[PDB]
Amino acid sequence: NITEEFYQSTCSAVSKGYLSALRTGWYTSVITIELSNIKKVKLIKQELDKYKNAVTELQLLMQFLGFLLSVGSAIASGVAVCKVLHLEGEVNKIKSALLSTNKAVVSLSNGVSVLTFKVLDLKNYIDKQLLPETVIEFQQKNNRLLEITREFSVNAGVTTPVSTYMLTNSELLSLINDMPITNDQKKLMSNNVQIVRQQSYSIMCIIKEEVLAYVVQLPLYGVIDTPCWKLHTSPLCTTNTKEGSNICLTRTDRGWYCDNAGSVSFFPQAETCKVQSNRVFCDTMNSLTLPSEVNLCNVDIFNPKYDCKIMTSKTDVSSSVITSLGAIVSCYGKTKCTASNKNRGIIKTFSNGCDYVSNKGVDTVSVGNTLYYVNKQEGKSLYVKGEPIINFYDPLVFPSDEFDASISQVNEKINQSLAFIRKSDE
Amino acid sequence: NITEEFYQSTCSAVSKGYLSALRTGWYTSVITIELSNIKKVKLIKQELDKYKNAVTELQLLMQFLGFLLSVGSAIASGVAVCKVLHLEGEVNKIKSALLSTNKAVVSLSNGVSVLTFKVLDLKNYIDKQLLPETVIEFQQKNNRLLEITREFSVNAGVTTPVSTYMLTNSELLSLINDMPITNDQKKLMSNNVQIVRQQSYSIMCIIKEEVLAYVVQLPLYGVIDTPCWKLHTSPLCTTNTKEGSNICLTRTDRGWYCDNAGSVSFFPQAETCKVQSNRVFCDTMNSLTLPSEVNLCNVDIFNPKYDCKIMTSKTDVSSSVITSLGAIVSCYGKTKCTASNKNRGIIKTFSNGCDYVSNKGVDTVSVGNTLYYVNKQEGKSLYVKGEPIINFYDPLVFPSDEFDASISQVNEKINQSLAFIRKSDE
Amino acid sequence: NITEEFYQSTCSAVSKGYLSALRTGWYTSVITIELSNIKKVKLIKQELDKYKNAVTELQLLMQFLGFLLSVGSAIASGVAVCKVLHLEGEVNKIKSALLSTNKAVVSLSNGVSVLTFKVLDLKNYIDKQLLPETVIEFQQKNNRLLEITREFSVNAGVTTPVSTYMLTNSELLSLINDMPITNDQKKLMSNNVQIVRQQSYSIMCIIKEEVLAYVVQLPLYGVIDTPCWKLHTSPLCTTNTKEGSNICLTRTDRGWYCDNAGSVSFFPQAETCKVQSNRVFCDTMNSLTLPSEVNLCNVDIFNPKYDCKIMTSKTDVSSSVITSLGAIVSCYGKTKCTASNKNRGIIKTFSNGCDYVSNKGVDTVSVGNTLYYVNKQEGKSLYVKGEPIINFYDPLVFPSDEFDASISQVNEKINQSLAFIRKSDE
């Protein structure tokens, strides 16, 4: 199932065996709550005043390679719907369709078909029972309105993750079933609703004509079940005796990779992706589209089809990288890097250089004064032995500070340092 | 109103037409809640014990160019007030002035005039009605105390945004009216209270002599209605056939710019600023003070009055930048960059290079495997055609990795690469 | 007590006098809540249905030198315990020991001794009193279950800081006393429980056999009361008349330093550390282990025992750094940098260069259009006058863009710029 390979030659590891679940687009839906414009006998007297204060508040409300990523507007789609609800009659168009039912699709003015929902009916409640047991239904239906108000006030009207007050599980699962997507998307979203909530936006919209409206921006997973893999990289330095004469090298192309429509979506920020079992939930807005030949950098970093990105330095500090099925340890200098078991203690001492250890039998990794716990996910690891490529470079002609560089950029910068020695032969 | 210009020569865009609302200073106010030191008939028995537990908890509580920004202490002003409240008698000085009223100004010991507030009076409530209808007022007045306690415990005593429990809308708006500032500030803060909350701090202070105190740090908007504009920049690379031989260039001076007292405040992190309609709420602590000649970089990047900051690389990856009134697309390589309408599909395919499209008629922008929604704010855009300045450079003498550089730094580094060729003429 | 020294020669300051409280390891504990599998008289009718909905939800739930830091898995230890609770019989092993008591240690299958806790007993409550005063105990015991559910749903099952619903103060303090650590750790954690909460994780685990379980990951403070100090650095540029001909220099080794087992733990991100009085709560996962000779860079930056890290540029923009006992001001160009008192106004105007001022007598620092408040902590400051080291460099042979560099890297790069002039003598 989940496997992992470590490349001693490049001091990197690839955790493959995952499945994709990428957000490609958005789905907007207008959630409405009908309100009553109002102006045992004493319990409602103080609970109805919370209603007058929530409406009072809501009216005051409306009235390494990460630097290469694009800069988009996340809620640009949802706000594009709220500018339509501000139009005259566009509110009554929704209030008319949501008359005899709570779920109805309303074709808006600008050719936008939105799935509207009437999740709460306070107008039909305050005007039917609160005109001079039922205090329970009021104190509970009003409590949800207060909670929607609290989230929209301490967030300037944009909520994420979408809480159960903006959309209950019964409303959300019913909204997932009714929205028109494939059967694979419907069950993927239904089995991981808390992930859909974290990738969803609740946008305060308008209060007009006894109605509170707010758009719930939901993710569309156009890419499902395609192979994904996470690349872990660590510095690869030399281990010479005299400190300072050491040169380093680090693959900067680390992050989440997923096959996507002939190309490969690369997420340089592994926190934009979320792993549930072997499923990887990412957001394409934080991605880069790369040719599928980018995977060649793991096996052969010197391949001619893709220029693998690296960074160079002389800072040979020790660091560890907890991988999906093990840990990469870059031990340099006088650092004490060990790998220990829970009930037995230290089982391996890392020699100077970049080494690797699997989580099978290892519980913690110690580098210096820091203790790192390894992930105990079951999986098979593989150690691909090889000569560290940092030994292939001459330290005297090695560029000591390149960050947005690659294998070829370093090689093409070394060769014209060897043009200066064509004058040295005088 | 809101306009935008795109510069093809520099692959950048300027969204002008905004108004300023910058936080220049702070305003401290001590919010107090009087407590009763205590030690239908059974409802209060379990509600009064929440009071004993909240007080028990609170006693345990107290007892690109972003790297150029300054490093300040945000709550340095508010904490400077809490060290004054710990002084002996300084608590009783407040408890004495807040005797017959809830709002009173207390001149503190170190020459600090603070606007004190008694938002809740539990001592006057527990000692007047809870000694052996009113269970409502207790269960609601005590519920606010519990909520103030919950926020101060899960935040180590510092709360932002200031919730309605720390300061209700009635208390906040009354605190805004009573604080001594100009009439323009009072209405700006009163119409955007949820923005003031997000720029405010609630700092737990002290519990001494039956009183709970906490300072609410409020923003002062010394700069209002001055012109602001947001600069969007994208990489500008060459489109040669052989990949790798391409050189790139990107204006690093992007962010929010606002005219401010002869100079211009520059916010390199556009997330420190918040846009409501055409108003821009920024925080000067995340700003840089630049000469007003910085705006010359948009029209002429080679102007002699200001050295426009750029960064160079050979990484010609495709990226898009969703602007205020459109989108900038930097399409390089085999990437499929398109701009589509909602109900009609693709309307433009971007050729290789840096192009631009306005939101009038365009709903989405596709670059690679990513879909970006454009902001649908109404405004007039302008395409300033011009020769891309990256064509003016020779790739063989082009510095391939400069980040904290400028136009002159590149030109002064190219010329001494042309001193090496004065030896080449042998 | 708390002191501070400013180094004019290197434009840096060291705030010493602190004590350490570093998280070295974790402590896992399984928190359990027994549930009843169910399927004045009408109050429970709607409160018991919240119980059926919380269980319904939870079942859907489960079923500068910062780039040198390591990459670990924070909850790798806690999740390693939840994979053990999913084993058959491992749930009943816990449900058996927590029979006659609420606190009991359960030795798990994989040789893991965990301190289990039964914080809530709803099975013993619903099955003892809710089969056809007590509505109070139900509406309050059920309200905690709802709050644990709300946090676990809007956070995908991982909560931090651990709220009082996951673990009350009575349960937490009792869990701190019963866990086996030294007496110094027990009182350190008991006096700063809100800090322990912010460094703790609440991980949703399993619902099986009428039991809800979730692991609370607690910090272990293996390093206590060792000396700590925070290094503040600011750019140090030249003040030549013609702008652009100026060279800059900045010590990149800023952050929190703490003596730790012969070495020194360095935290380049000062936000990973938390200061309470003179105690510094850090997390070693965001640390680097450096030789104790790193402190030599403050007194003599040119010392031969450690290569002090610096960065160079030509960007002479003005910036300020609010220190622990004062403020560092780097005033360059036409910027107006002042230091003012509260009741008297400007008391010092900063000349061009890097200067410093103590908080004794100063309340604010103004640099450009920004107002910075100084921290008013009582302490003695010291101004170590010295020649700024930037004057020791020739601007014509000064590397204008080095970030991951040091004193020796610059000196070894200057000398081979002086090899090019051995050809200039022709």
Ligand SMILES: Cc1ccc(O)c(Cn2c(NC3CCN(CCN)CC3)nc3c(C)cccc32)n1
């Ligand atoms: C080694 C390293 C590690 C992490 C880090 O954030 C940086 C900072 N940094 C540099 N490096 C500068 C400039 C280029 N080089 C200049 C050689 N003449 C080296 C010093 N280029 C950057 C780019 C392009 C984007 C974002 C950050 C960049 N460098």
